[PDB]
Design a protein around this nucleic acid. Sequence first.
RNA 1: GCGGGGUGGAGCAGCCUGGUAGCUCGUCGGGCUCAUAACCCGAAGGUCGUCGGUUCAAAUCCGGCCCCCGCAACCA
RNA 2: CCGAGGGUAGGGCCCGUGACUGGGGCGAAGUCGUAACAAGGUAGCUGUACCGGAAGGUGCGGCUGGAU
RNA 3: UGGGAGAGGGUGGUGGAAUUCCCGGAGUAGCGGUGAAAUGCGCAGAUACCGGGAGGAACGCCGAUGGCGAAGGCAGCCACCUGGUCCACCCGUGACGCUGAGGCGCGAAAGCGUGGGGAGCAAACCGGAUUAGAUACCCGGGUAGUCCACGCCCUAAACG
RNA 4: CGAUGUCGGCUCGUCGCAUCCUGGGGCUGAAGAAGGUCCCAAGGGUUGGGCUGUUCGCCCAUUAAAGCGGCACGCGAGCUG
RNA 5: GAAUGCCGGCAUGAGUAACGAUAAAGAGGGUGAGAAUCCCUCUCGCCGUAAGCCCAAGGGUUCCUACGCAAUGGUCGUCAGCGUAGGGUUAGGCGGGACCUAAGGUGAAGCCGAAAGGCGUAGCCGAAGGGCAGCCGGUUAAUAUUCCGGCCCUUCCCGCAGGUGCGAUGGGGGGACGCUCUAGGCUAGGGGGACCGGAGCCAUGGACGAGCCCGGCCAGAAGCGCAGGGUGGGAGGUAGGCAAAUCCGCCUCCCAACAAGCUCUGCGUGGUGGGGAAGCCCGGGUGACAACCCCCCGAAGCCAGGGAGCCAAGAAAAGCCUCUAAGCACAACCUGCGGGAACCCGUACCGCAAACCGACACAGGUGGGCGGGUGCAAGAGCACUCAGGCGCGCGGGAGAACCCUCGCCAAGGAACUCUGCAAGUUGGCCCCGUAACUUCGGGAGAAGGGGUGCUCCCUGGGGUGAUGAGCCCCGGGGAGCCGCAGUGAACAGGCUCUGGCGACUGUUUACCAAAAACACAGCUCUCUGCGAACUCGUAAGAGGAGGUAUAGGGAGCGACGCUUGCCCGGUGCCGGAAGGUCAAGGGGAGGGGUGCAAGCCCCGAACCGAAGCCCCGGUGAACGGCGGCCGUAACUAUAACGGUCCUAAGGUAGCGAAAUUCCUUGUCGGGUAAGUUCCGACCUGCACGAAAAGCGUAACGACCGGAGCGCUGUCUCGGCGAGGGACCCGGUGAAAUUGAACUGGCCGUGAAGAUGCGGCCUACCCGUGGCAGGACGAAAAGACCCCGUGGAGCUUUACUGCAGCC
RNA 6: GAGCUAGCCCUGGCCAGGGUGAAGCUGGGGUGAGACCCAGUGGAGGCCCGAACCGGUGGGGGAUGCAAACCCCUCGGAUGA
Lengths: 48, 275
Amino acid sequence: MKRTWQPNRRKRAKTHGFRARMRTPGGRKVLKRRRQKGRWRLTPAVRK
Amino acid sequence: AVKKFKPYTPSRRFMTVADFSEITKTEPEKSLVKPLKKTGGRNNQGRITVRFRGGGHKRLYRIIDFKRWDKVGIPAKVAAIEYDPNRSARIALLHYVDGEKRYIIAPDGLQVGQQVVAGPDAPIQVGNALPLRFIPVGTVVHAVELEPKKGAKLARAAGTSAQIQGREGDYVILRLPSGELRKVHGECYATVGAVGNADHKNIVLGKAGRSRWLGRRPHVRGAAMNPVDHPHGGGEGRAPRGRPPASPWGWQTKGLKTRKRRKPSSRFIIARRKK
RNA sequence: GCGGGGUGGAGCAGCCUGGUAGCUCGUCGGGCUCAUAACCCGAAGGUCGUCGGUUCAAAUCCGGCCCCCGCAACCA
RNA sequence: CCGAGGGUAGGGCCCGUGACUGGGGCGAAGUCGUAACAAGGUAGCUGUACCGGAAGGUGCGGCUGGAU
RNA sequence: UGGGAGAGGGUGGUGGAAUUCCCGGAGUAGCGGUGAAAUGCGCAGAUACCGGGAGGAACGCCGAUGGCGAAGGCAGCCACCUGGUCCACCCGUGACGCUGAGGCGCGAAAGCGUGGGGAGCAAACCGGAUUAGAUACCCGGGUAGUCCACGCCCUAAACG
RNA sequence: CGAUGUCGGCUCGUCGCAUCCUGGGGCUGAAGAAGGUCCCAAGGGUUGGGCUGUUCGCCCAUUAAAGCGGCACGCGAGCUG
RNA sequence: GAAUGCCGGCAUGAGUAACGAUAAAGAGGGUGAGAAUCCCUCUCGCCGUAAGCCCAAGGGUUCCUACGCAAUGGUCGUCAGCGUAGGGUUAGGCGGGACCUAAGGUGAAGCCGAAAGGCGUAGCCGAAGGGCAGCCGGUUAAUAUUCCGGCCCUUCCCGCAGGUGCGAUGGGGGGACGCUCUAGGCUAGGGGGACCGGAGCCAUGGACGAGCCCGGCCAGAAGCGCAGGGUGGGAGGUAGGCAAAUCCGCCUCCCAACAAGCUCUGCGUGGUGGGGAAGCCCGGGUGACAACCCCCCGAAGCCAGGGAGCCAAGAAAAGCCUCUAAGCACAACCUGCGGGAACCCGUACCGCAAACCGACACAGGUGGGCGGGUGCAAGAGCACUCAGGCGCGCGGGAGAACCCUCGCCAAGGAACUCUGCAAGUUGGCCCCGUAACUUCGGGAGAAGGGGUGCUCCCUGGGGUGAUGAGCCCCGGGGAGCCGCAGUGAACAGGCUCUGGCGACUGUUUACCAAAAACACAGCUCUCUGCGAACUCGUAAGAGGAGGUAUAGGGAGCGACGCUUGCCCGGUGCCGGAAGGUCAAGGGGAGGGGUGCAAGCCCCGAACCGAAGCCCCGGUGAACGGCGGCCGUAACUAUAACGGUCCUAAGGUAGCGAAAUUCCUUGUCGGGUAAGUUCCGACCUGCACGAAAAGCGUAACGACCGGAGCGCUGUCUCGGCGAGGGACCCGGUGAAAUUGAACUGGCCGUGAAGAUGCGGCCUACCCGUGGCAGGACGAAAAGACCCCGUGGAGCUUUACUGCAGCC
RNA sequence: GAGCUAGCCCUGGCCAGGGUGAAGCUGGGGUGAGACCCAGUGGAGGCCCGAACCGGUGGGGGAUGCAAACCCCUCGGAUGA
Ligand SMILES: [Mg+2]
Ligand SMILES: [Mg+2]
Ligand SMILES: [Mg+2]
Ligand SMILES: [Mg+2]
Ligand SMILES: [Mg+2]
Ligand SMILES: [Mg+2]
Ligand SMILES: [Mg+2]
Ligand SMILES: [Mg+2]
Ligand SMILES: [Mg+2]
Ligand SMILES: [Mg+2]
Ligand SMILES: [Mg+2]
Ligand SMILES: [Mg+2]
Ligand SMILES: [Mg+2]
Ligand SMILES: [Mg+2]
Ligand SMILES: [Mg+2]
Ligand SMILES: [Mg+2]
Ligand SMILES: [Mg+2]
Ligand SMILES: [Mg+2]
Ligand SMILES: [Mg+2]
Ligand SMILES: [Mg+2]
Ligand SMILES: [Mg+2]
Ligand SMILES: [Mg+2]
Ligand SMILES: [Mg+2]
Ligand SMILES: [Mg+2]
Ligand SMILES: [Mg+2]
Ligand SMILES: [Mg+2]
Ligand SMILES: [Mg+2]
Ligand SMILES: [Mg+2]
Ligand SMILES: [Mg+2]
Ligand SMILES: [Mg+2]
Ligand SMILES: [Mg+2]
Ligand SMILES: [Mg+2]
Ligand SMILES: [Mg+2]
Ligand SMILES: [Mg+2]
Ligand SMILES: [Mg+2]
Ligand SMILES: [Mg+2]
Ligand SMILES: [Mg+2]
Ligand SMILES: [Mg+2]
Ligand SMILES: [Mg+2]
Ligand SMILES: [Mg+2]
Ligand SMILES: [Mg+2]
Ligand SMILES: [Mg+2]
Ligand SMILES: [Mg+2]
Ligand SMILES: [Mg+2]
Ligand SMILES: [Mg+2]
Ligand SMILES: [Mg+2]
Ligand SMILES: [Mg+2]
Ligand SMILES: [Mg+2]
Ligand SMILES: [Mg+2]
Ligand SMILES: [Mg+2]
Ligand SMILES: [Mg+2]
Ligand SMILES: [Mg+2]
Ligand SMILES: [Mg+2]
Ligand SMILES: [Mg+2]
Ligand SMILES: [Mg+2]
Ligand SMILES: [Mg+2]
Ligand SMILES: [Mg+2]
Ligand SMILES: [Mg+2]
Ligand SMILES: [Mg+2]
Ligand SMILES: [Mg+2]
Ligand SMILES: [Mg+2]
Ligand SMILES: [Mg+2]
Ligand SMILES: [Mg+2]
Ligand SMILES: [Mg+2]
Ligand SMILES: [Mg+2]
Ligand SMILES: [Mg+2]
Ligand SMILES: [Mg+2]
Ligand SMILES: [Mg+2]
Ligand SMILES: [Mg+2]
Ligand SMILES: [Mg+2]
Ligand SMILES: [Mg+2]
Ligand SMILES: [Mg+2]
Ligand SMILES: [Mg+2]
Ligand SMILES: [Mg+2]
Ligand SMILES: [Mg+2]
Ligand SMILES: [Mg+2]
Ligand SMILES: [Mg+2]
Ligand SMILES: [Mg+2]
Ligand SMILES: [Mg+2]
Ligand SMILES: [Mg+2]
Ligand SMILES: [Mg+2]
Ligand SMILES: [Mg+2]
Ligand SMILES: [Mg+2]
Ligand SMILES: [Mg+2]
Ligand SMILES: [Mg+2]
Ligand SMILES: [Mg+2]
Ligand SMILES: [Mg+2]
Ligand SMILES: [Mg+2]
Ligand SMILES: [Mg+2]
Ligand SMILES: [Mg+2]
Ligand SMILES: [Mg+2]
Ligand SMILES: [Mg+2]
Ligand SMILES: [Mg+2]
Ligand SMILES: [Mg+2]
Ligand SMILES: [Mg+2]
Ligand SMILES: [Mg+2]
Ligand SMILES: [Mg+2]
Ligand SMILES: [Mg+2]
Ligand SMILES: [Mg+2]
Ligand SMILES: [Mg+2]
Ligand SMILES: [Mg+2]
Ligand SMILES: [Mg+2]
Ligand SMILES: [Mg+2]
Ligand SMILES: [Mg+2]
Ligand SMILES: [Mg+2]
Ligand SMILES: [Mg+2]
Ligand SMILES: [Mg+2]
Ligand SMILES: [Mg+2]
Ligand SMILES: [Mg+2]
Ligand SMILES: [Mg+2]
Ligand SMILES: [Mg+2]
Ligand SMILES: [Mg+2]
Ligand SMILES: [Mg+2]
Ligand SMILES: [Mg+2]
Ligand SMILES: [Mg+2]
Ligand SMILES: [Mg+2]
Ligand SMILES: [Mg+2]
Ligand SMILES: [Mg+2]
Ligand SMILES: [Mg+2]
Ligand SMILES: [Mg+2]
Ligand SMILES: [Mg+2]
Ligand SMILES: [Mg+2]
Ligand SMILES: [Mg+2]
Ligand SMILES: [Mg+2]
Ligand SMILES: [Mg+2]
Ligand SMILES: [Mg+2]
Ligand SMILES: [Mg+2]
Ligand SMILES: [Mg+2]
Ligand SMILES: [Mg+2]
Ligand SMILES: [Mg+2]
Ligand SMILES: [Mg+2]
Ligand SMILES: [Mg+2]
Ligand SMILES: [Mg+2]
Ligand SMILES: [Mg+2]
Ligand SMILES: [Mg+2]
Ligand SMILES: [Mg+2]
Ligand SMILES: [Mg+2]
Ligand SMILES: [Mg+2]
Ligand SMILES: [Mg+2]
Ligand SMILES: [Mg+2]
Ligand SMILES: [Mg+2]
Ligand SMILES: [Mg+2]
Ligand SMILES: [Mg+2]
Ligand SMILES: [Mg+2]
Ligand SMILES: [Mg+2]
Ligand SMILES: [Mg+2]
Ligand SMILES: [Mg+2]
Ligand SMILES: [Mg+2]
Ligand SMILES: [Mg+2]
Ligand SMILES: [Mg+2]
Ligand SMILES: [Mg+2]
Ligand SMILES: [Mg+2]
Ligand SMILES: [Mg+2]
Ligand SMILES: [Mg+2]
Ligand SMILES: [Mg+2]
Ligand SMILES: [Mg+2]
Ligand SMILES: [Mg+2]
Ligand SMILES: [Mg+2]
Ligand SMILES: [Mg+2]
Ligand SMILES: [Mg+2]
Ligand SMILES: [Mg+2]
Ligand SMILES: [Mg+2]
Ligand SMILES: [Mg+2]
Ligand SMILES: [Mg+2]
Ligand SMILES: [Mg+2]
Ligand SMILES: [Mg+2]
Ligand SMILES: [Mg+2]
Ligand SMILES: [Mg+2]
Ligand SMILES: [Mg+2]
Ligand SMILES: [Mg+2]
Ligand SMILES: [Mg+2]
Ligand SMILES: [Mg+2]
Ligand SMILES: [Mg+2]
Ligand SMILES: [Mg+2]
Ligand SMILES: [Mg+2]
Ligand SMILES: [Mg+2]
Ligand SMILES: [Mg+2]
Ligand SMILES: [Mg+2]
Ligand SMILES: [Mg+2]
Ligand SMILES: [Mg+2]
Ligand SMILES: [Mg+2]
Ligand SMILES: [Mg+2]
Ligand SMILES: [Mg+2]
Ligand SMILES: [Mg+2]
Ligand SMILES: [Mg+2]
Ligand SMILES: [Mg+2]
Ligand SMILES: [Mg+2]
Ligand SMILES: [Mg+2]
Ligand SMILES: [Mg+2]
Ligand SMILES: [Mg+2]
Ligand SMILES: [Mg+2]
Ligand SMILES: [Mg+2]
Ligand SMILES: [Mg+2]
Ligand SMILES: [Mg+2]
Ligand SMILES: [Mg+2]
Ligand SMILES: [Mg+2]
Ligand SMILES: [Mg+2]
Ligand SMILES: [Mg+2]
Ligand SMILES: [Mg+2]
Ligand SMILES: [Mg+2]
Ligand SMILES: [Mg+2]
Ligand SMILES: [Mg+2]
Ligand SMILES: [Mg+2]
Ligand SMILES: [Mg+2]
Ligand SMILES: [Mg+2]
Ligand SMILES: [Mg+2]
Ligand SMILES: [Mg+2]
Ligand SMILES: [Mg+2]
Ligand SMILES: [Mg+2]
Ligand SMILES: [Mg+2]
Ligand SMILES: [Mg+2]
Ligand SMILES: [Mg+2]
Ligand SMILES: [Mg+2]
Ligand SMILES: [Mg+2]
Ligand SMILES: [Mg+2]
Ligand SMILES: [Mg+2]
Ligand SMILES: [Mg+2]
Ligand SMILES: [Mg+2]
Ligand SMILES: [Mg+2]
Ligand SMILES: [Mg+2]
Ligand SMILES: [Mg+2]
Ligand SMILES: [Mg+2]
Ligand SMILES: [Mg+2]
Ligand SMILES: [Mg+2]
Ligand SMILES: [Mg+2]
Ligand SMILES: [Mg+2]
Ligand SMILES: [Mg+2]
Ligand SMILES: [Mg+2]
Ligand SMILES: [Mg+2]
Ligand SMILES: [Mg+2]
Ligand SMILES: [Mg+2]
Ligand SMILES: [Mg+2]
Ligand SMILES: [Mg+2]
């Protein structure tokens, strides 16, 4: 049966991408959060 | 005169279609259509603000000339009478001797090849657009402005009419299609005659699907829902309203008046509606 | 179990708030009519379901017994 | 091959019969009213409509086979 | 061929009286209704009166014992379209006629369907009276219907 | 109640005897046949259907007879639902 | 030492279940230390509208080659999508970008919001839509419309020639459109040939044949031929297309008119460039100088923006063409020609799967194109087969119970069971034939029945072609042959009678309910005059609607037919400029404080004073409600009728033991041998009843009742057979569970159901296949129930607030 | 967080084959003209049978599964909401 994960590069980077995070106050705080923690990736990798 | 089908399917039994007889041009004037943004009932927040809307046939919007006082004294010939799906009426194409083309709401009795005109000096014949204050008292009329130069707003649906009961200063007294008696400014424009396609009310849609083609999605009774949904939701088995019959949002629906109290229009409504 | 009732012959008031039994019909006698009904004039008939208490006094207030309607009798 | 008939399936007509149900006819002295015949005490009859225990009533139109 | 009389029919238009409602005025203690009353309405201003507006329906006098139509039936006035009929002349065809099972059409009222319209009226229904009762007659209301268009129904004391 | 699955059917039985039948008896208002009533007896037996979820019951047709109860109203780590 | 404690480690079940579709294997030869498992061959079987092939997404080196086998692979492993290393993806023309817009997103102007932010015309962004120039072959271990060969084409820059009022983000045209049906001519693809080429073949009884087997093409510029698409020409006037305009629109006039012409596509041919089989002999070479022709079928694809019909009325923008304005006409543009210039990113590989989404090399999921042949009426159906791909990554044996899937069964034939649940029967085509009823369409594939193969003979019409042969497509008649049987295999309705509910096709609880539930056309009520009501938002702003009472919101009812009675006292709503009550505010009779005093300051009556409520009316397809007792007829019984109490009014029509009836399996009738169900009646309706609609109703229904025929392993009642497991052997090897265990029966006892206490009886030690009575077996800190001054959803005339509205 | 799901918006795509035969149009009949009748033509429909596709009715299997919804047989829609 159709499972929930149907990957899509365009959907991934438009939804969770860096520029998506940057245009929203919540989103910026996410990036601030992940920098503070030392996350290697601030953003889900997607091959464009 | 509406058109019946033989009952060769359960739906063809009662389904009736317009006769389309008065229509003489089966395709719109390309210089006068434009993309009609289908809304499906959603507003600029993306929220259903008018329930049960969507999924109907694609349409192009024929531009209608609800002003007509743009071209005082410029007569025009009746090119054709077409189909407009964005309204209950028919539209008539105008080939202005100016060389300009416009659509108007087709009245009843308007004939292709006749010439109409708009303005204070116009003749009192079907199709001419005059300022209200110049049309003889007692004559029917349509496409009426509510305020001068603001656009035709009254009597534009198929079959509707408006009769001029009398005058009083800068204002004439109209009987609207609702039966309401209203004072409208005399300088407001209107068109001699009643909108055509009177037989529009006798169309029997015939089956669910036809309603769906019209953009009209299925409607759910609050009685069929649950208390989180609607004042009439809940109850074991069927149930009477069990409370004053109400809408999903609380307010009552059987008699409760909703016109705004202090509305300045009230000074010009002479007699509220009828039947 | 919880509520209401029981009074001339029929159906009802009076009970709450003790001292008084009242209304319609019917029944009896008289009248009008040739006669009956209707109508009119008079009258009689209820010891208040029963027993027991309270009271100076109980249809009435409080118990018991009897009958008679009404509601409830749910969770597995 | 045809073929009496036998068999299978489906029709049409007639007759008998059937819980119950419909009105009808008749039946010396039942109950309820009083609808019609006098202007029958609201003239009657009528087609239709609706209504009512019942006769009937009422509306709409008609007829005199209505009176003074 | 020339003439005539007629509410014959269909369409469109339109006139005035009256009723009801609404608006303004002025005015106040009742009005309405009956056999007598009550319901009802009215001091939250009715009735009566003047002016204004809206809407529907029927057309007073003429009107007659009259006229027209095959019948049902047709009544303000105007115009268009259309049927019938009588008279005159004595002009044309030359028995081309009468009737009519069937068939077809029209067919008052009520009634039905789809739209409209709704003043007055009014089955149903409600109320007030009367009465033993009064699911009636009388009184106050009142919905269909009555009215228009289209389509049905096809009835009659459709009678002379 | 940190779970003992609950009616009925099916399958499989097994036990009790207050015995439905078959076996042995006394009394009888037991002539015979056939019944009634009680005693002894649990070895074996104790049908097929219509209706209802039904247990039960009623009915049809037979029978020697169409017994009654226990086994967590026997039996869902056996089935059914 | 216990917390169903936390972490880790190791046990138990156990050599146990399983090792993942029952499409299937066998032998020979190789390699290597080792082989059922890797390589090669021959045989067998499986897919073939796929299990073959090509795209897109997703994946991200998984590709190719060499060398490896510890782990991964459910066994093995010499193999591999595994480890190591090396290699491999080449474009002006394919895709995307340097082009265009769609929803949507962003957003100078602007608007709004405590902050953050929300809006918003233009513009910008945004694609699998528009627009735009490459086709056939060869080549590598691995890339190819990309390299190479051939033959084509595009844009930009510049130059030359000719032409022209040139010039645009500005005007106009075009782009530019649905659904169904569909003409002509093509092409893709396919069938056949007694014709053309071909290595070879003659078997086992026959055949040296008009025999067999295999092939008989692809691309191509200009032109030409065929078939289509698109398209009037000229003149005069002009006020419209927000400047101008010779363009476009409008009007008049003349000519042309199914044409033609001009133009643009498709197809065919076309200089030329390629391809080329079986068979054989080692991916190659030979075949071969291969031949490359005729006929038929033929698209859903092409011409194409084709045609007709219909209603539900079917994007935008650029490219492109045209018009002109600034300007500029030494320019510029157009046409032809030449040279030069032409960047960025993708390209490997899987891609219905072992490489994607499912934790797995997972029987699941995943959009597009191609998808051959024969027969069965057709077809993407079915069976078998081509190309091509596979035998599913444990095997060998055995031939028990039992389980699964499947085959047959004497006699009976639903007796099974809640139920014909299941499984039978029926089954395509053609012909004959078909009832009640009906809304006249239907019911209908009703029901029921006949036929169906092969051979010879005669013959009718059609497409092609030519009017003929040939091929191909429909038929008709006659005579025969064979079998148990002719849609001989596969795929392919059982039917009827009669109720309930719902009109109908639809919709639904993803993952226990598909229904009678929701929806539905239709009916009514009601709100709304437009800056509409209503909705979402603090707002701006949006939806409603670029709509306007024949429209839009809300509510009930639910096709259609015949209908929908009475009650307005209570609640809701609508109306009501009187009255009564009524807050802030107004007002200020008159009090109080303080001060020497002017003053400052406090309280405060009458009276004026909104909505709401009170009060007066209306209102049911508004919330709703629609009685009791007693008596009465010339047999009895029952009451048409009467008496009285109460109400706002006392349930009308129609229906009724009903999806509703308690007593109840009511009573009567039908059906049956027998009927708690069914149907038909009756009416004391516990507790129908009229838009939470009432009574019907053709048709429809994987709904729920009842009955019959057919036919059956459902059953009496079971038997036998098949294969996949179970069983045995080699390989790999779990799980929940588990205080420890040296873990028997009875009758007692015990916290009331004891392997564990007592008495007695039984009993050598340990396994294997089976069964499921017990271990109050496992799982789950009972969902029932109660408790907790635990929680959450829902309600309202509970309380108190708030939005909103007045 | 709407890469599952639900609705809507934009833009594309897909639905083998067979069956039934509405209006209309033609011809004829009919009539004063009509209504209408017949035959041919036509190809309508939330029409019919049935693949793909979308589903999920009944039964069986599965139940530490192939699978945290699967498999087999059967069944519903299949130009339309
Ligand atoms: Mg899903
Ligand atoms: Mg997706
Ligand atoms: Mg993407
Ligand atoms: Mg994408
Ligand atoms: Mg996306
Ligand atoms: Mg976003
Ligand atoms: Mg992003
Ligand atoms: Mg911030
Ligand atoms: Mg780092
Ligand atoms: Mg992030
Ligand atoms: Mg019709
Ligand atoms: Mg029209
Ligand atoms: Mg445009
Ligand atoms: Mg919009
Ligand atoms: Mg927006
Ligand atoms: Mg937003
Ligand atoms: Mg948002
Ligand atoms: Mg809404
Ligand atoms: Mg909506
Ligand atoms: Mg229109
Ligand atoms: Mg509209
Ligand atoms: Mg005005
Ligand atoms: Mg309608
Ligand atoms: Mg639409
Ligand atoms: Mg609804
Ligand atoms: Mg509900
Ligand atoms: Mg619900
Ligand atoms: Mg919610
Ligand atoms: Mg609620
Ligand atoms: Mg409710
Ligand atoms: Mg409910
Ligand atoms: Mg409900
Ligand atoms: Mg209920
Ligand atoms: Mg209700
Ligand atoms: Mg209620
Ligand atoms: Mg309410
Ligand atoms: Mg109004
Ligand atoms: Mg009292
Ligand atoms: Mg007293
Ligand atoms: Mg009294
Ligand atoms: Mg006393
Ligand atoms: Mg409870
Ligand atoms: Mg015989
Ligand atoms: Mg007597
Ligand atoms: Mg009399
Ligand atoms: Mg009389
Ligand atoms: Mg009288
Ligand atoms: Mg009456
Ligand atoms: Mg008064
Ligand atoms: Mg006064
Ligand atoms: Mg009026
Ligand atoms: Mg007169
Ligand atoms: Mg003469
Ligand atoms: Mg009364
Ligand atoms: Mg009296
Ligand atoms: Mg009297
Ligand atoms: Mg008539
Ligand atoms: Mg317990
Ligand atoms: Mg436990
Ligand atoms: Mg259990
Ligand atoms: Mg059994
Ligand atoms: Mg004895
Ligand atoms: Mg025994
Ligand atoms: Mg029991
Ligand atoms: Mg019983
Ligand atoms: Mg018993
Ligand atoms: Mg015996
Ligand atoms: Mg137990
Ligand atoms: Mg017990
Ligand atoms: Mg079980
Ligand atoms: Mg059980
Ligand atoms: Mg157990
Ligand atoms: Mg157990
Ligand atoms: Mg067992
Ligand atoms: Mg301890
Ligand atoms: Mg544990
Ligand atoms: Mg713990
Ligand atoms: Mg732990
Ligand atoms: Mg460790
Ligand atoms: Mg551990
Ligand atoms: Mg370990
Ligand atoms: Mg151990
Ligand atoms: Mg072990
Ligand atoms: Mg074991
Ligand atoms: Mg296992
Ligand atoms: Mg397994
Ligand atoms: Mg399989
Ligand atoms: Mg297979
Ligand atoms: Mg080695
Ligand atoms: Mg090996
Ligand atoms: Mg090995
Ligand atoms: Mg082998
Ligand atoms: Mg090999
Ligand atoms: Mg991966
Ligand atoms: Mg290894
Ligand atoms: Mg190694
Ligand atoms: Mg491994
Ligand atoms: Mg594996
Ligand atoms: Mg190994
Ligand atoms: Mg190239
Ligand atoms: Mg550049
Ligand atoms: Mg660049
Ligand atoms: Mg704020
Ligand atoms: Mg973007
Ligand atoms: Mg872009
Ligand atoms: Mg693109
Ligand atoms: Mg497009
Ligand atoms: Mg390109
Ligand atoms: Mg090319
Ligand atoms: Mg190539
Ligand atoms: Mg190389
Ligand atoms: Mg367009
Ligand atoms: Mg269509
Ligand atoms: Mg070609
Ligand atoms: Mg072929
Ligand atoms: Mg070529
Ligand atoms: Mg000009
Ligand atoms: Mg082209
Ligand atoms: Mg070769
Ligand atoms: Mg050679
Ligand atoms: Mg196609
Ligand atoms: Mg095309
Ligand atoms: Mg053409
Ligand atoms: Mg645009
Ligand atoms: Mg110059
Ligand atoms: Mg030029
Ligand atoms: Mg490549
Ligand atoms: Mg698949
Ligand atoms: Mg695919
Ligand atoms: Mg693979
Ligand atoms: Mg999984
Ligand atoms: Mg996952
Ligand atoms: Mg595997
Ligand atoms: Mg082939
Ligand atoms: Mg076939
Ligand atoms: Mg295999
Ligand atoms: Mg397979
Ligand atoms: Mg064995
Ligand atoms: Mg199998
Ligand atoms: Mg067989
Ligand atoms: Mg055999
Ligand atoms: Mg048998
Ligand atoms: Mg049988
Ligand atoms: Mg039989
Ligand atoms: Mg078959
Ligand atoms: Mg057959
Ligand atoms: Mg029949
Ligand atoms: Mg029927
Ligand atoms: Mg019929
Ligand atoms: Mg069929
Ligand atoms: Mg048949
Ligand atoms: Mg047939
Ligand atoms: Mg034959
Ligand atoms: Mg043969
Ligand atoms: Mg079938
Ligand atoms: Mg249904
Ligand atoms: Mg339903
Ligand atoms: Mg119905
Ligand atoms: Mg319905
Ligand atoms: Mg369907
Ligand atoms: Mg479910
Ligand atoms: Mg669920
Ligand atoms: Mg779930
Ligand atoms: Mg769930
Ligand atoms: Mg299920
Ligand atoms: Mg359900
Ligand atoms: Mg269903
Ligand atoms: Mg519904
Ligand atoms: Mg329905
Ligand atoms: Mg209706
Ligand atoms: Mg209405
Ligand atoms: Mg708008
Ligand atoms: Mg009917
Ligand atoms: Mg009321
Ligand atoms: Mg009231
Ligand atoms: Mg009220
Ligand atoms: Mg007030
Ligand atoms: Mg109530
Ligand atoms: Mg009430
Ligand atoms: Mg009635
Ligand atoms: Mg019963
Ligand atoms: Mg009954
Ligand atoms: Mg019964
Ligand atoms: Mg019933
Ligand atoms: Mg009931
Ligand atoms: Mg019962
Ligand atoms: Mg019985
Ligand atoms: Mg009984
Ligand atoms: Mg019987
Ligand atoms: Mg009874
Ligand atoms: Mg029916
Ligand atoms: Mg259905
Ligand atoms: Mg169903
Ligand atoms: Mg039978
Ligand atoms: Mg068996
Ligand atoms: Mg076997
Ligand atoms: Mg085995
Ligand atoms: Mg051994
Ligand atoms: Mg081993
Ligand atoms: Mg291993
Ligand atoms: Mg121990
Ligand atoms: Mg031990
Ligand atoms: Mg032991
Ligand atoms: Mg032992
Ligand atoms: Mg014990
Ligand atoms: Mg022991
Ligand atoms: Mg011990
Ligand atoms: Mg012991
Ligand atoms: Mg012991
Ligand atoms: Mg023992
Ligand atoms: Mg075992
Ligand atoms: Mg056990
Ligand atoms: Mg146990
Ligand atoms: Mg325990
Ligand atoms: Mg659990
Ligand atoms: Mg629990
Ligand atoms: Mg806990
Ligand atoms: Mg707990
Ligand atoms: Mg607990
Ligand atoms: Mg619960
Ligand atoms: Mg408890
Ligand atoms: Mg408390
Ligand atoms: Mg406490
Ligand atoms: Mg609490
Ligand atoms: Mg707030
Ligand atoms: Mg409001
Ligand atoms: Mg999604
Ligand atoms: Mg199809
Ligand atoms: Mg057929
Ligand atoms: Mg046509
Ligand atoms: Mg089955
Ligand atoms: Mg299957
Ligand atoms: Mg189908």
